[PDB]
Amino acid sequence: AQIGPVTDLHITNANISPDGFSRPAVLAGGTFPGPTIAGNTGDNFQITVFNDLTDPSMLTDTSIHWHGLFQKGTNWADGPAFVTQCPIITGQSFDYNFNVPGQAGTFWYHSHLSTQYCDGLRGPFVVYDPNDPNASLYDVDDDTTIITLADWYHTLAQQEPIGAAITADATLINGLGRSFTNTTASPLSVITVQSGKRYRMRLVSISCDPNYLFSIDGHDMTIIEVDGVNSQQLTVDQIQIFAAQRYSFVLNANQPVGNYWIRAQPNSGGQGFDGGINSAILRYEGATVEDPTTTAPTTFSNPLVETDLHPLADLGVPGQPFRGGADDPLVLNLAFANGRFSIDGVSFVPPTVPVLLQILSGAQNAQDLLPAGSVISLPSNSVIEVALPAGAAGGPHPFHLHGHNFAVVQSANNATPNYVNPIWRDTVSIGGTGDNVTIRFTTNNPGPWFLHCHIDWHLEAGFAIVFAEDIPDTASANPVPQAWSDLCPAYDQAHNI
């Protein structure tokens, strides 16, 4: 069952063994992944999060972010710890009460305190459209068509030793998969289809780090949505999906009744499919209950290339059709050294007072805001351009902007900008050395919006900045409930701050 749009959500510790190895975890709704939160476009979500965490090895505080939802007028509900709230302490609850006007598509929810989402607090979040312009392209779209891709670690997130390399121990597809080392034949996930029907598969990366090469033996995939944005139909046989991205694709169950490998190849950790790692099973009704015997091609025929995507709607691009053709053109210097990332020479360290609270308390320029140099003001009602040139170690880095989606004016591995019809999305690979991935948006959403690499280990190591969008209007635009005002006093009392 899907839950929502008005629902309780309990956060707990428990042991799980998704790849056969037992470890404690941080769970929403008692499961990994968490339950799908869903509603319809424009609905009021009220998600009352109960923090019932008792195991300090994975932190007993928490904060949840509703990834890709714009939160206009509810910046207080966005989730990122010390940007928009103080964390919820154990034994307390908090009602994330917000609305989703003008959005429909595939999203997700995750802890946004430290690297706690790696420990398990990650789930899908779907906003259906009763008048979906893509409705007629498929027959089935429900909880059974959601496909999550997750990295899973046997070492707890807080206990990753500083100075050693971090790689995962299993790829989990719909919460199951097999360990890269000491592989056991634990259960694989099964996605069931009926011969002749068409399915809106909602492909969600809930990854803390690796990108996946996703494919389904014998099948192709027709992409119709990119991070919440309806796309023209694009048929591909493989999708490279970066951390926090979503695609919907039409799967036509048009192959012979049988079993077909679903493949998700991470860019780090175990390479290949030996022992059934990196795999799930696509099973047609009436097939024998047995593993697929299919194989991948040596080379895929039609891999997704981001420049091939275009919006279904005539979304265009704001500003002028050249570099710097914006009201506020920015170029970020994105760097890594000595274990820390930095943006324009500053490494993000979360402040003691959340940025939003600072602004509501009367700090009214970005140079008054802490951390110093990590908060950049944006002017209201203006076209913003942000070039994100790559080269920092640990790439390719998927950059994500809260409160907004954006036109991808230039994509990875292609020096040509597109000022006519590029895809809009909310998380984008900035590519490789020499690249100049560039985004554009307009500022019609007052508040502090986080911008950061979505590799959670990089965010923890400082690869972030806060855009304080329309500081003058932030208080008037984002009235705050008493419960929100109560968070920082309660958090600060519980931690003796």
Ligand X SMILES: *[C@@H]1O[C@H](CO)[C@@H](O[C@@H]2O[C@H](CO)[C@@H](O)[C@H](O)[C@H]2NC(C)=O)[C@H](O)[C@H]1NC(C)=O
Stretch that binds ligand X, among 44-52, 265-273, 321-329, 392-400 (CB under 6 A): 321-329
Q: Does 387 bind ligand X (CB under 6 A)?
A: yes
**C-beta of 87 vs 276, nearer to Cu ion:** 87
Find the shortest distance in angstroms from Cβ 324 to ligand X. Answer: 3
Q: 27, 45, 67, 251: which one contacts Cu ion (CB under 5 A)?
A: 67
**C-beta of 279 vs 358, nearer to Cu ion:** 358
Stretch that binds ligand X, among 248-256, 257-265, 285-293, 324-332 (CB under 6 A): 324-332
Q: Does 455 bind Cu ion (CB under 5 A)?
A: yes
423 contact, one of Cu ion, ligand X, none, CB 5-8 Å limit per kind: none
Q: 258, 350, 389, 398: which one contacts ligand X (CB under 6 A)?
A: 389
Q: Does 402 bind Cu ion (CB under 5 A)?
A: yes
Q: 202, 246, 283, 397: which one contacts Cu ion (CB under 5 A)?
A: 397
The answer to whether 452 touches 342, Cβ cutoff 8 Å, is no
- Phi, psi values for residue 289, rounded to 5°: -80, 90
Cα separation, 462 vs 130, in Å, equals 41
Find the shortest distance in angstroms from Cβ 119 to ligand X. Answer: 36
User: SS3 string of the chain?
Assistant: CCECCEEEEEEEEEEECCCCCCEEEEEECCECCCCCEEEECCCEEEEEEEECCCCHHHCCCECEEEECCCCCCCHHHCCCECCCECCECCCCEEEEEEECCCCCEEEEEEECCCCHHHHCCEEEEEEECCCCCCHHHCCECCHHHEEEEEEECCCCHHHCCCCCCCCCCEEEECCECCECCCCCCCCCCEEEECCCCEEEEEEEECCCCCCEEEEECCCCEEEEEECCEEEEEEEECEEEECCCCEEEEEEECCCCCCEEEEEEEECCCCCCCHHHCCEEEEEECCCCCCCCCCCCCCCCCCECCHHHCCECCCCCCCCCCCCCCCCEEEECCEEEECCEEEECCECCCCCCCCHHHHHHCCCCCHHHCCCCCCEEEECCCCEEEEEEECCCCCCCCEEEECCCCEEEEECCCCCCCCCCCCCEECEEECCCCCCEEEEEEECCCCEEEEEEECCHHHHHCCCEEEEEECHHHHHHHCCCCHHHHHHHHHHHHHCCC
Catalytic residue flag (residue 10): no
Catalytic residue flag (residue 112): yes
Catalytic residue flag (residue 454): yes
Q: Which two tokens stand for residue 21?
A: 């190895």
Q: Which two tokens stand for residue 328?
A: 């506020």
Q: Does 487 bind Cu ion (CB under 5 A)?
A: no
Cα separation, 470 vs 493, in Å, equals 31
Catalytic residue flag (residue 219): no
**Which position's Cβ is nearest ligand X?**
324
Find the shortest distance in angstroms from Cβ 383 to ligand X. Answer: 13
Stretch that binds Cu ion, among 94-102, 314-322, 441-449, 457-465 (CB under 5 A): 457-465
The answer to whether 477 touches 403, Cβ cutoff 8 Å, is no
**C-beta of 439 vs 487, nearer to ligand X:** 439
Find the shortest distance in angstroms from Cβ 419 to ligand X. Answer: 7
**C-beta of 321 vs 481, nearer to ligand X:** 321
Q: Does 244 bind Cu ion (CB under 5 A)?
A: yes
Find the shortest distance in angstroms from Cβ 399 to Cu ion. Answer: 8
* Active-site pick, 37, 64, 454, 488: 454
Q: Which two tokens stand for residue 474?
A: 């932030």
Find the shortest distance in angstroms from Cβ 275 to ligand X. Answer: 36
**C-beta of 178 vs 397, nearer to Cu ion:** 397
Q: 323, 364, 394, 494: which one contacts ligand X (CB under 6 A)?
A: 323
Catalytic residue flag (residue 458): yes
Stretch that binds ligand X, among 137-145, 234-242, 272-280, 323-331 (CB under 6 A): 323-331
402 contact, one of ligand X, Cu ion, none, CB 5-8 Å limit per kind: Cu ion
Catalytic residue flag (residue 400): yes
389 contact, one of ligand X, Cu ion, none, CB 5-8 Å limit per kind: ligand X
Note the residues at the interface with Cu ion (CB under 5 A): 67, 244, 397, 402, 450, 453, 455, 458
Q: Which residues are catalytic?
A: 65, 67, 110, 112, 397, 400, 402, 452-455, 458, 463
Residue list, annotated binding site for Cu(2+): 65, 67, 110, 112, 397, 400, 402, 452-454, 458
Q: Which residues bind ligand X (CB under 6 A)?
A: 305, 307, 323-324, 329, 331, 387, 389, 414, 416, 418, 436, 438
